[PDB]
C-alpha cells in the first residue's frame, strides 16, 4: 500500500524537482524488487493505462528502473504486452490506446527498440486488410498507430524510414477508401467556416503529415527522460514479443467514430502565446491531455479545475483558451458527453474563481462565438448550450450584454438565434421569477421573454354557462372543495352528456384548476383521485384525452406539464406510448419544436429504459419463471415505444416533404431542421438500445424506398458501428 502511494503521487507538488523525485523513486522501487516485484509490475501496468496524462513521467520511471535492472524491464515489457492483449479482449479499446502509447514512448526512453514498434504498427495497419470486419475495427488500429506518433514519430523515422513510408502508404490508401456516412450525424456544426468540423482520422492524418513535413519536430510534449540522456541508452533496449491483433468476433465492440470539435485559432487570442494550429500535433496532444485530466478528476470539481490550470508544457500556450475549448468539446460531443452535463457548468464556475482576471473574458468571448455560429449548430448541441448558458447566467445575477445579439430580433422566430434566446429566457425564468427575467433584457427583447405561467380554466368566471358540461363542472368544483370522495365524483360525472370525452374534460379541467397553486397540490390531487384517472383513462383514447386536456389547461406552464406527465407515467395513469403519440398530435403542433416537448419525450423514454434495467437486474439476481416473462414483456413495451416514435417521425416528415413538393417550396425550413435533428437525437441518445431493433427497423420502417432525407438519418446511425 506504501508503494502504490509513492507511484500514484509521483510528479505532483513538491520542493524537489521531478528529475530528483524520479531518480529517487527509481532506487526505492529497485530495493523493493526482491519482495515486491510482482506488485511493482502491477502498479506500473496500472498507471500506464489509468494515468495517460502522466505518460512521459512514468515511461521515464520505467526507463530509470530498467537501467538498474535489465531483467525487470524485460518482465515489465512482457507484462505490458499481456495487458494490451487482455484490454483488447475485454473490448477496452480506449485503455488499449494508452498502453500502445506507453510502449511507444518507451522507445524514446530506450527501453524498447524502435523496430519492435515499427513491427507492431505494421501489424496494426494490416488490420485494414482483414475482410468482412467493421470499419470501426480497422479505424481503431489505425488510430492507435497514428495517435502514438507525436511521441515516437521521430525515433521511428530515423531508425526505419523506408519501413515507415511503406506503412504510411498503406495507411493513406485505407483512409482514402473509408466511408464518411457518419460525419453529418456527429458534427456540432455543418458549416465549413470559420472552422471545419473534421472527421477524427482525416484530421489526425493531416496532423501527422505536417509533423512529417516539419521533420518530426514538435514543441509541446514534456520529455523528462531527456534529462537522463547519459543514463538511458540503446544498450538497455528490449525486443518485443510478437503481437497479433485479436481477430474480430461476435462479442467485439469497437469505439464509435468521432468528429473533432473546433472553435478557436490564434487570431482569437492576439495578446497571448501563439495558439498551435488545427493541423499541428501539438493541438492534438494538448486537448488529448486536457480531456484525460478531466476524465481522472471529473468527480472533484475543485481538483479538476486546479489540474487543468496547472497543465505543463515545453513551450507557452494560451491554456485558458485550450481549457474552454476542451470543455465545450466534451459538452457538445455527439452522441453524448463523456460525463454528466451539469458537471461542465460547475467546472467553468470553479475555473472562473481560480482565474478571475482572465478566464471570464475568454468564456465571454467563446459564448459570443457560439451564438454567432448558431445557424448550423446541431439541435442536440443547442439544447445543451441553452441549458448551460441559462444555468451559468443564474450564477452571475443573470447579467449579459443582450444588445450584442440584436441581430436575432429581425429574423424569423423559428430561426436558431431568436429561438435560442427565447429558450434561454424560458430556462432562466424556471430558476427565477417572471417579472425578474422580463427585467434582465433590454426593451427591444421584451417580446422574446416567456409568457406568465398562468393556469387556463375553461369553466371559470368568464366562460358561458352554454358550454357542454358547464353545470356538471360547477358541481365538481364544490365537490372537490368539500373534500368529496372518488365515489362522489364518479356519481357527479354521470351527469355528463356524451369513452366519454366530456367526462374527462370536466374532471381534468376542474381538478387541475383547483390545485393550480403548486406542484405539491397538483401531485396530491393526482393521488387523491387516482382511481378516477385510471378509470377514465383505461383505454388508449382516454390516456390521450387526459394528456390533451391537461395541455389545454397548462400550456403556459411547460414545467408543470413535464412534472404532471412524469407523475402520470409513474402512477400508471397513462403509458409511454400514449405520451409518444400525444407528442406528435395536432394539439401540440405549434409547440412541437420547443425544448420542453423533447425533454418530456426523452424523460419518458428514460423511465421505460430504467424500468427494463430494473427487471433485468432482478431476474439477474434470482438466477424465476415469473420474471423471465416479465422481462420480455417490458422489453416488448420498450421496443414498441421506439417503433411508434420512429413511425410518427416518418409520418410527419413525409407529410412535410409531400407538402413542399406539392407547393414547390424548399424542404429546408427551420421547422424541418428541428424535426430531422430531433429524429437524429433519438438515435444518438439511445443508440445502444436501438441497435437491437436493426432487423425490424430495416424491414418495416427505414426501408430502401423511404425518401432519402429520412433514410439517411438511419444510414448515419448504422455507420456508428459499421
Amino acid at each position: 500500500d506504501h508503494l502504490e502511494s509513492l507511484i500514484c503521487k509521483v510528479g505532483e507538488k513538491s520542493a524537489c524537482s521531478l528529475e530528483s523525485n524520479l531518480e529517487g523513486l527509481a532506487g526505492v522501487l529497485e530495493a523493493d524488487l526482491p519482495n515486491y516485484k510482482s506488485k511493482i509490475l502491477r502498479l506500473l501496468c496500472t498507471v500506464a493505462r489509468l494515468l495517460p496524462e502522466k505518460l512521459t513521467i512514468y515511461t521515464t520511471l520505467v526507463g530509470l528502473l530498467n537501467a538498474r535492472n535489465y531483467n525487470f524491464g524485460g518482465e515489465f515489457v512482457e507484462a505490458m504486452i499481456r495487458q494490451l492483449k487482455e484490454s483488447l479482449k475485454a473490448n477496452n479499446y480506449n485503455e488499449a490506446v494508452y498502453l500502445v502509447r506507453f510502449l511507444s514512448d518507451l522507445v524514446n526512453c530506450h527501453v524498447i527498440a524502435a523496430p519492435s514498434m515499427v513491427a507492431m504498427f505494421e501489424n496494426f495497419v494490416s488490420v485494414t486488410q482483414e475482410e468482412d470486419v467493421p470499419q470501426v475495427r480497422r479505424d481503431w488500429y489505425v488510430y492507435a498507430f497514428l495517435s502514438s506518433l507525436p511521441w515516437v514519430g521521430k525515433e521511428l523515422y530515423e531508425k526505419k524510414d523506408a519501413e515507415m513510408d511503406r506503412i504510411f502508404a498503406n495507411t493513406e490508401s485505407y483512409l482514402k477508401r473509408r466511408q464518411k456516412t457518419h460525419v453529418p450525424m456527429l458534427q456540432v456544426w455543418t458549416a465549413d467556416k470559420p472552422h471545419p468540423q473534421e472527421e477524427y482520422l482525416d484530421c489526425l492524418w493531416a496532423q501527422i503529415q505536417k509533423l512529417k513535413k516539419d521533420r518530426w519536430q514538435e514543441r509541446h510534449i514534456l520529455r523528462p527522460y531527456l534529462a537522463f540522456d547519459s543514463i538511458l541508452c540503446e544498450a538497455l533496449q528490449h525486443n518485443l514479443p510478437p503481437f497479433t491483433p485479436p481477430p474480430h468476433t461476435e462479442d467485439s465492440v469497437y469505439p464509435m467514430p468521432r468528429v473533432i470539435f473546433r472553435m478557436f485559432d490564434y487570431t482569437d487570442d492576439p495578446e497571448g502565446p501563439v495558439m498551435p494550429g488545427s493541423h499541428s500535433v501539438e493541438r492534438f496532444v494538448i486537448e488529448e491531455n486536457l480531456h484525460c485530466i478531466i476524465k481522472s478528476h471529473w468527480k472533484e470539481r475543485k481538483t479538476c479545475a486546479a489540474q487543468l490550470v496547472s497543465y505543463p508544457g515545453k513551450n507557452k500556450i494560451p491554456l485558458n483558451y485550450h481549457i474552454v475549448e476542451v470543455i465545450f468539446a466534451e459538452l457538445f460531443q455527439l452522441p453524448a458527453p463523456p460525463h454528466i452535463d451539469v458537471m461542465y457548468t460547475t467546472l467553468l464556475i470553479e475555473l472562473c474563481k481560480l482565474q478571475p482576471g482572465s478566464l471570464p473574458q475568454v468564456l465571454a468571448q467563446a459564448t459570443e462565438m457560439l451564438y454567432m455560429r448558431l445557424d448550423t449548430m446541431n439541435t442536440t448541441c443547442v439544447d445543451r448550450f441553452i441549458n448551460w448558458f441559462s444555468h451559468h447566467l443564474s450564477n452571475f445575477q443573470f447579467r449579459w450584454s443582450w444588445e450584442d445579439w440584436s441581430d436575432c430580433l429581425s429574423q424569423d422566430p423559428e430561426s436558431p438565434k431568436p429561438k435560442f434566446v427565447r429558450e434561454v429566457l424560458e430556462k432562466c425564468m424556471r430558476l427565477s421569477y417572471h417579472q425578474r427575467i422580463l427585467d434582465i433584457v433590454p426593451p427591444t427583447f421584451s417580446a422574446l421573454c416567456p409568457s406568465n405561467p398562468t393556469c387556463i380554466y375553461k369553466y371559470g368566471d368568464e366562460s358561458s354557462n352554454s358550454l357542454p358540461g358547464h353545470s356538471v363542472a360547477l358541481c365538481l368544483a364544490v365537490a372537490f372543495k368539500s373534500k368529496a370522495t372518488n365515489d362522489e365524483i364518479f356519481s357527479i360525472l354521470k351527469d355528463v352528456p356524451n369513452f366519454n370525452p366530456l367526462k374527462i374534460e370536466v374532471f381534468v379541467q376542474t381538478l387541475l384548476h383547483l390545485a393550480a397553486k403548486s406542484f405539491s397540490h397538483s401531485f396530491s390531487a393526482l393521488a387523491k383521485f387516482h382511481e378516477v384517472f385510471k378509470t377514465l383513462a383505461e383505454s388508449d383514447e382516454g390516456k390521450l384525452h387526459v394528456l390533451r386536456v391537461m395541455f389545454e389547461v397548462w400550456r403556459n406552464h411547460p414545467q408543470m406539464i413535464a412534472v404532471l406527465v412524469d407523475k402520470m407515467i409513474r402512477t400508471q395513469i397513462v403509458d409511454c406510448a400514449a405520451v409518444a403519440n400525444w407528442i406528435f398530435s395536432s394539439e401540440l403542433s405549434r409547440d412541437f419544436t420547443r425544448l420542453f416537448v423533447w425533454e418530456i419525450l426523452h424523460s419518458t423514454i428514460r423511465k421505460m429504459n430504467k424500468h427494463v434495467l430494473k427487471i433485468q437486474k432482478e431476474l439477474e439476481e434470482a438466477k424465476i419463471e415469473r420474471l423471465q416473462e416479465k422481462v420480455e414483456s417490458a422489453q416488448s413495451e420498450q421496443k414498441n415505444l421506439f417503433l411508434v416514435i420512429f413511425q410518427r417521425f416518418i409520418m410527419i416528415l413525409t407529410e412535410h416533404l409531400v407538402r413542399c413538393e406539392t407547393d414547390g417550396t424548399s424542404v429546408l425550413t427551420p421547422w424541418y431542421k428541428n424535426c430531422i435533428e430531433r429524429l437524429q437525437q433519438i438515435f444518438l441518445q439511445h443508440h445502444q438500445i436501438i441497435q437491437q431493433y436493426m432487423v425490424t427497423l430495416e424491414n418495416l420502417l427505414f426501408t430502401a424506398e423511404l425518401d432519402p432525407h429520412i433514410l439517411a438519418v438511419f444510414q448515419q446511425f448504422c455507420a456508428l458501428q459499421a
Binding site: K299, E300, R301, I340, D341, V342, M343, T345, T346, I349, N387, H391, S394, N395, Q397, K427, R430, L431, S432, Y433, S518, F519, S520, Q559, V563, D566, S603, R606, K607
Partner: protein
C-alpha cells in the same frame, strides 16, 4: 454514518425565503430524477424558513447533486446540500 451512505435524500440549506418548490425542481433535476421535494415552513405562519429536502430515486443522482449543485447559486444565494438520513413527519418546520 452507515445510514448517510445509502440515502438518496439531501437536506438543502441557506435557501432564500422567496425560493419555491418549482425552482428547486428545475435546479436539482439537473443531476437526476427527483422523487419528492418537501419545503421547510414556519411552524406558525406556514411560511418558508430557508431549507428543504430533496429525495432522488437513485443514489447516483443524489451524489451528482452533492458534487455539482452543492455550493452553487439559487436566487443569488450560495446553497448547501448535506446527506440526510431521511425525512420524518414534523421536520419540515
Amino acid at each position: 454514518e452507515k445510514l448517510l451512505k445509502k440515502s438518496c435524500t439531501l437536506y438543502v440549506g441557506n435557501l432564500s425565503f422567496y425560493t419555491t418548490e418549482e425552482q428547486i425542481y428545475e435546479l436539482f433535476s439537473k443531476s437526476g430524477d427527483i422523487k419528492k421535494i418537501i419545503m421547510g415552513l414556519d411552524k406558525m405562519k406556514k411560511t418558508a424558513c430557508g431549507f428543504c429536502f430533496v429525495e432522488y430515486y437513485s443514489r447516483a443522482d443524489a451524489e451528482n447533486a452533492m458534487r455539482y449543485i452543492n455550493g452553487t447559486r439559487l436566487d443569488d444565494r450560495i446553497i448547501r446540500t448535506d446527506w440526510d438520513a431521511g425525512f420524518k413527519e414534523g421536520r419540515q418546520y
